[PDB]
DNA sequence: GCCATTTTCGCGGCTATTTTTTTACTCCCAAAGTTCCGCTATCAGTTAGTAAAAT
DNA sequence: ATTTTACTAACTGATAGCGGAACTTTGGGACACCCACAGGTTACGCGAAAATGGC
RNA sequence: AAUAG
């Protein structure tokens, strides 16, 4: 199996899972630990943001690669926004400070 | 830094390395 | 989609010096992910260097590996400089060679 | 193993309150006490007296400063309830928080980046 | 809901009639409970008349299943209901409750249906790149035209503008002339249709 | 962009500020047109349009009218992704205790009010009265009265004292607390104490009280009056192949809450007997507890599939929760 | 990449400097100071660092010169 | 009654999609005994002795 | 009022690949809001024709 | 003298509005007497911490 | 659930 870009989840906005759905591989916790142990911060940020759930960032990354620029503009993963919304729905004020 | 042979560099996540190093071999574990 | 020959030449030129990340589950330590230079082969199976198998705990009895493509220049240089198999030949747990 | 043991010895119970903002019988982080004691010695005032505590890896993980990492580990309801009643603030200093929020981890290639920010906040 | 019905029954009891309170109150309690079921038992609300139609369809289907020994086909149910078969099929598919997104898929137990639902509203990155390319190509083609014709076409199609414009306000630019604006737009389209300056835009069809 | 994440209690005003409207009906979508119903759990007037730059009317249907609210419908002409961000609110007819600040041991309400959890539940479950304003009477704050005793002392004293029962009583008790005074009292009592058990108790309670004083939170915010409502696109009702619909359990929980709230309002409008009103208040509390954390209070509410409904706590927690399934690890593109 | 880490000292710093140089050769119009030999910008930057032509101070100095001009 | 029998025959844990790679797979599947299922053990809760 | 014993609470590896489920049931009527077909009427676009101009 | 084009008027389609009757939809009512519920469950095990009990 | 590592 191989995938570059395809379908995405409805809520988490992450790639689907499975060869039947043309999904992507799961970069689990232990893979993140391996990347942290190496020190590959930029590879890890690519995996977290522009390959999984940064909706604007992943489109910008595809356009940049098509233009031959190979640069990313990471943003906030959608799963974190979902987490903020559910914690707020539990009647708890969670917010980001500048 | 055991994986590199020289003194450890700044920014090396040594805690993750320590945890992985300890955890990986866990499967092998059971007057003259 | 039509798989023209010029597409294959373009693919060779693309992968000429683009490192690719190989992973095997469970990733018990950081040597479970390493970067390699890809050589295009006819077939459907990934060819793995023997001397790295001990790092991956990988044997050829049905094992499957995942492959990831670093996109940006920083990720490519991290793959070449930190995660490349030639850099990781000592065990971070003990300092002993791992490609024996 | 010494790194893990260091992470096990991270808390202290205050035996003498002194004049620092610490109550007797309070389990607080050792680094905070050390910084406060350095400041008070610079001010020439009575320092706090503490007894260091050894916690298990699970308890030490659950008693970290950041509630994002503690919630991501386990016992999410307890961690979130305690943080909500306390009004805690997470400065995103470790790896897990920056992984969750999509930022560069403060280790390796991202380390310098974070350092630069700590300069700009200082200025 | 039955308690509310009972209060309504107490509000309008008549002891002169000689009947006991249970006789009258049972009707109101039944009505309140059943109306509450009709109004609040479904994620997608079905009106009361359709609820009665569905329930009586179920009763007739159960009696016919007892009668003939196999499931009643829609035409037989339609004949017994004195209703069209199309109405029967309508009632049949609108009488299904929504499925849960936590329901396992297949024989699994750690799988969930919601894990396999796409986001059909998303735009493919190939399409976004094609849109950007079309914008660039249109700008380049317009750059090879007279500024008046380029501006007229831009206003008439809304390119690089918030709104599209009709011939009247395009005439309002310099000379308010619908027949003239129409002619210059036709000229611009004719020049853009020439094969010399249309091979770039032909590839987007 | 941001330098820290701040957590704390949510005030009713904060929950109203988050909200773009009030959910008044348990309706979701029409059964024929499949369009959102007004003032429902999927209202386009509250949460946003269902199509990009359109209204339910179909009158304003382009980018030329961006940001314009249709007078016939009320749907703002904007994008559809706003339905993943816009929240709503429900104005509860009676206050409801928050299950996390009540049953997640140790109980914060009990620790702050220095009353055992069993007594708090007895007041909440409408089994025992509690004195809110003792007045010019021998009665003390927080002392429990049975219905018999409450009637006796109501005849005895009259309107001198106020005694309540339920979450309103706990809210009144929490609102009347003087936090600096309590902090001073615990400090003074800790000065002149010798037993280590009582020392532990007072040090824990003093930590809680001074945390409340420093944080700016108010204790009565642990009792909910306005209930936030999640964006619809995070609890979707989407069509499957063949006309079937897939839904989230949060819709069932929210519908239960809204129905019980509306029934409470209608019972109060009808001036029902107090037993029915107490029953409805118990059911409202149970529904909100099920929505927040299912199974913590008691028997977990189950759906038609005979399995417990998944609540917000289950959304955020566990091995299969958001932290571990989607945040610490992800599915990625450009992989094989 | 032993020569590059010897010339820089830290692998992370080497990665950052090589990324800046590769972005200069790819996104910017800057030309390579060594024979390209049909190599990607990352490998060209690594070779330049190994040869001692590119360092962090050199990059900062050239940026300052560009800003002055 | 029909609901009960279809539940058992289609959605039970012991009603399994038949193994049909070869004749031996079918024979072995029909002669298989599970400790799991309704009224049995659980994978995670089962111990060494069983 | 502290020392021990019983009761909840939370936890129990990672990647893949095969596949939906199933009980339970009044009716009628009057009043109200909505829809669906048909017709009207206006405006804008398109097209055919003819004169005006240019070769 | 002929050919191309610009101007103009007529046709036609889309569309907003309206009529009105059929259609869907909502709320009220029903008078032998009926008067306290489920409702499956569980062969986990371990460690902590929190709540009870003992004198 | 079953299967592979
Ligand atoms: Mg093997
Ligand atoms: Zn509208």
mmCIF file of C-alpha atoms in Angstrom, chain B residues 10-11 13 15-16 18-19 22, chain D residues 1 3-4 95 106-108 111:
data_model
loop_
_atom_site.group_PDB
_atom_site.id
_atom_site.type_symbol
_atom_site.label_atom_id
_atom_site.label_comp_id
_atom_site.label_asym_id
_atom_site.label_seq_id
_atom_site.Cartn_x
_atom_site.Cartn_y
_atom_site.Cartn_z
ATOM 1 C CA UNK B 10 22.845 20.562 23.975
ATOM 2 C CA UNK B 11 19.234 19.762 23.190
ATOM 3 C CA UNK B 13 16.442 14.394 24.829
ATOM 4 C CA UNK B 15 15.170 11.094 29.188
ATOM 5 C CA UNK B 16 13.462 9.497 26.192
ATOM 6 C CA UNK B 18 16.968 6.432 28.947
ATOM 7 C CA UNK B 19 13.368 5.228 29.014
ATOM 8 C CA UNK B 22 15.531 0.475 29.908
ATOM 9 C CA UNK D 1 18.784 4.555 35.506
ATOM 10 C CA UNK D 3 18.124 9.863 34.882
ATOM 11 C CA UNK D 4 14.997 7.943 35.867
ATOM 12 C CA UNK D 95 8.022 17.526 24.720
ATOM 13 C CA UNK D 106 12.320 21.896 22.749
ATOM 14 C CA UNK D 107 14.940 19.260 21.950
ATOM 15 C CA UNK D 108 17.434 18.807 19.156
ATOM 16 C CA UNK D 111 15.960 23.487 20.932
#
